[PDB]
């Protein structure tokens, strides 16, 4: 240790005018005791099998050398505090050095973790390591398929379970897709089965077939082992079709699910724009297709509602800028559905869903950038769509923020 730190300590104690040989005598004695303890604290690190040298190793190394592990305070009578340590304090250099005494009481205590249990598994089966989650990772000859027959049978069982005849079968197959480590090298056949399926499954609008395939896409995405952005060029136009397509079946009975089909598709769409991101290829391409779906005149209202759902779930900054200028076209579309008597078509249902989603999204956008003053009739400057009900939604959001 440096001697110019030992003279600062001495003159801040009342011992002034110390010589350099007196001061060098202090810094070779205490630097030996640090070296004697750190060599002795490495014994507790090597028998604790942790190669870490935690803060408690010096507490036992001090107690071994008959020195109290008491730090920051030394009791000359020893009777109140013996060789038991006080685990020091939580330290940071960047601390506040003054807290309020009721701030420490009102904070929630951390959760005591689970107790130690003994689980057994298999490192090796007769020499081979299994891929369980407890483990880390002139005629030309007749060729063999690159899948095994156990793997091909597994693919057949998982695909016949993922078409959702039974719900428990689906859910396991979805978890099996979500965490099989060896599901690479089978992934082309899964991507092709998804893509091909949606395209011949929108020829007749079979909603379950589609809701099961979208859940299969979601189960494919959250698997951490497999490399997906080689196959996302097949995955993205499948989800795009699910959100922006018309429904060939009866829309009114399942339009509630249809909103969820567009709900699940817009979730996985913004999750795909969150991952796999490079410069100006994926997110901007689907944003441009969503905007030209919106600005297109005389749309199908199923497509229009799907395009709205897609443009709505894109995050914080997207919605505010995109909706701002449109504050009139949406209202005019709602007014046309209202005026024309035609009720047996799906136009009225599409209009109500679109208006509710646009209004609900507007409430956070308004709650997010501006105070909640004049929540009664100022929204009449924005054609009076949600008005006081929008203000009530903003108030509910403020109450949720207060609860947080």
């Amino acid at each position: 240790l440096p001697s110019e730190s030992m003279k600062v300590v001495a003159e801040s104690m009342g011992i002034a005018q110390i010589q350099e040989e007196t001061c060098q005598l202090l810094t070779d004695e205490v630097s030996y005791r640090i070296k004697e303890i750190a060599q002795d604290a490495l014994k507790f690190m090597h028998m604790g099998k942790r190669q870490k040298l935690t803060t408690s190793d010096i507490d036992y190394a001090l107690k071994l050398k008959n020195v109290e592990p008491l730090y920051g305070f030394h009791a000359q009578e020893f009777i109140p505090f013996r060789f038991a340590s006080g685990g020091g304090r939580e330290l940071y250099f960047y601390e506040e050095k003054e807290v309020d005494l009721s701030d420490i009481i009102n904070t929630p205590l951390p959760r005591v973790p689970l107790d130690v249990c003994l689980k057994a598994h298999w490192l090796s089966i007769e020499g081979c390591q299994p891929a369980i989650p407890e483990n880390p990772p002139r005629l030309k000859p007749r060729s063999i398929h690159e899948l095994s027959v156990e793997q091909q049978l597994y693919y057949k069982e998982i695909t016949e379970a993922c078409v959702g005849s039974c719900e428990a079968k689906r859910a396991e197959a979805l978890q099996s897709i979500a965490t099989d480590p060896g599901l690479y090298q089978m992934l082309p056949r899964f991507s092709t089965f998804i893509s091909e399926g949606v395209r011949v499954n929108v020829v007749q609008n079979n909603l379950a077939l589609l809701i099961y395939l979208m859940r299969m896409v979601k189960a494919l995405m959250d698997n951490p082992t497999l490399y997906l952005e080689k196959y996302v060029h097949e995955l993205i136009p499948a989800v795009m079709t699910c959100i922006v397509s018309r429904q060939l079946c009866l829309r009114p009975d399942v339009d509630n699910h249809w909103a969820l089909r567009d709900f699940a598709a817009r979730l996985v769409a913004q999750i795909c724009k969150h991952f796999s991101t490079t410069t100006n290829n994926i997110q901007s391409r689907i944003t441009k297709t969503f905007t030209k779906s919106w600005v297109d005149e005389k749309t199908p209202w199923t497509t229009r509602y799907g395009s709205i759902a897609g443009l709505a779930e894109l995050g914080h900054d997207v919605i505010k800028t995109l909706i701002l200028p449109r504050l009139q076209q949406e209202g005019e579309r709602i007014r046309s559905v209202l005026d024309g008597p035609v009720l047996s078509n799906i136009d009225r249902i599409g209009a109500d869903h679109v208006q509710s989603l646009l209004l609900k999204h507007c409430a956070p956008v308004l709650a997010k950038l501006r105070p909640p003053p004049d929540n009664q009739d100022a929204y009449r400057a924005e054609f009076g769509s949600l008005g006081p009900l929008l203000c009530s939604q903003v108030v509910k959001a403020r109450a949720q923020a207060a609860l947080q």
């Binding site: 395209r199 929108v202 020829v203 952005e229 080689k230 996302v232 060029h233 993205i236 136009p237 795009m240 079709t241 922006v244 397509s245 018309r246 060939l248 796999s276 490079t278 290829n281 994926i282 391409r285 689907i286 297709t289 199908p300 497509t303």
Partner: peptide, 25 residues
């Protein structure tokens, strides 16, 4: 850097939006 493998993956080089079935009939 324009020779990076991703540039050549066909998700970043294909107008796959055109595929999404728009009111198929």
């Amino acid at each position: 850097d324009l020779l990076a493998d991703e540039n050549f993956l066909m998700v970043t080089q294909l107008h796959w939006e055109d595929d999404i079935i728009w009111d198929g009939e």
